[PDB]
Amino acid sequence: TAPAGFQLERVVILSRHGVRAPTKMTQTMRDVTPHQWPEWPVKLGYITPRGEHLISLMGGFYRERFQQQGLLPKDNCPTPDAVYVWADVDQRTRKTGEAFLAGLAPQCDLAIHHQQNTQQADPLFHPVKAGICSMDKSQVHAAVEKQAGTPIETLNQRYQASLALMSSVLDFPKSPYCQQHNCDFSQAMPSRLAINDDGNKVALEGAVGLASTLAEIFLLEHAQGMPKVAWGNIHTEQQWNSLLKLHNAQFDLMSRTPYIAKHNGTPLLQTIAHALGSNITSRPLPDISPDNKILFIAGHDTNIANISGMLGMTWTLPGQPDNTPPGGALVFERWVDNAGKPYVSVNMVYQTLAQLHDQAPLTLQHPAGSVRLNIPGCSDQTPDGYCPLSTFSRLVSHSVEPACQLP
């Protein structure tokens, strides 16, 4: 528990959506294995009912935690002013918002907020897609190469054992892809950085990008509790970790790389900071009370990775091979000590892979996972993890791209 006299005043939760069906199932994805991909019970890209339940289990945890620390009421529904949800436009994030409220405040008549037009990107989450700002294609190449520490064309050489493992789990040698190109998974698909003319769309092509997607899909199959996960081929924790290493690397390159991170993460970073009490300007969330205690932002793994890259936070998650798992969230807390001095603390809160698979109840006695995070740039951050707000404010204002602020 926190230091003597310390009081939790305000929380900002940046959460990934819950377990979802694969966003897409391409021809390449089908061709790299002779096995058939399992059918999901929802449309591609939608949160599953189980994904919603899992999220509500996390909302239950947050309720108990925020009651303990004095921020929410014991028993009683919270006032509507106390809790606010802003979700991205997608079905998966809106339903994540809704499921959070059902767990945080069961049978309370609360509702989420989101952009009015859901058929257009919300610039808070995707400023680049929404046309707020754009990147330079050449600077993207250099930044990504800098982040990998090596030419991207050689990336697969950093991940030979992981790729080989993905190859056996797929039975890639006996796949259609290989009867159409006659076979090694790494050699067949060298890494490359591809960017469109606009510099508005960037992707890692080749084996590490493809395997990142596949590995996440296997993790989601497990979290969904599907009868067969990767066709029975993942047996050990070591194999999970080795598969998901591809996915975390892909995210580091495509979303943590600071040049990319700041173009995509600036609006959220500014919004978070402002909710925490920074004197920095930010586009207001509609209908939010000055008296708001809990701001829950329902977004994506790319958002968390963006914020991570901007603030330089890294972590690994005990029992959870995905660094940005379904329902995992960055939880920013505003604390004041007894002299009234405000600090920021940041945790990565998540469900372990076993908590997802077992749909485990999350309570103070049987909690969600949680990792206390260092902010390297905050040189006056205390050993117990508090970052003075005045320092946190400066840090943010130096990390943002001014061209990507929401005007």
Residue numbers in the entry: 3 to 184, 189 to 413
Published text:
The apoHaPhy structure at pH 7.5 was refined at a resolution of 1.90 Å with one monomer in the asymmetric unit. The first two residues of the N-terminus, five residues (184–188) in a small disordered loop and three residues (414–416) at the C-terminus were disordered. Six side chains on the surface were modelled as dual conformers, while Glu181, Gln182 and His183 have poorly defined side chains and lie at the start of the disordered loop. The model includes seven glycerol, five acetate and 306 water molecules. The overall fold conforms to that of known HAPs with an α domain (residues 25–45 and 137–264) and a α/β domain (the remaining residues) with two α helices on each side of a twisted β-sheet. The two central helices of the α domain form part of the active site, which lies in a pocket at the interface of the two domains. HaPhy possesses four disulphide bridges involving cysteines 79/110, 135/410, 180/189, and 384/393, the latter being highly conserved in all known HAP structures. While Arg20 in EcPhy moves significantly to form a contact with the scissile phosphate, in HaPhy the corresponding Arg22 is already in the “contact-ready” conformation in the apo-structure, superimposing very well on the ligand-bound arginines from both the EcPhy and HaPhy complexes. Yet another difference from the EcPhy active site structure is that there is no change in the conformation of Glu222 (Glu219 in EcPhy) between the apo and ligand-bound states.
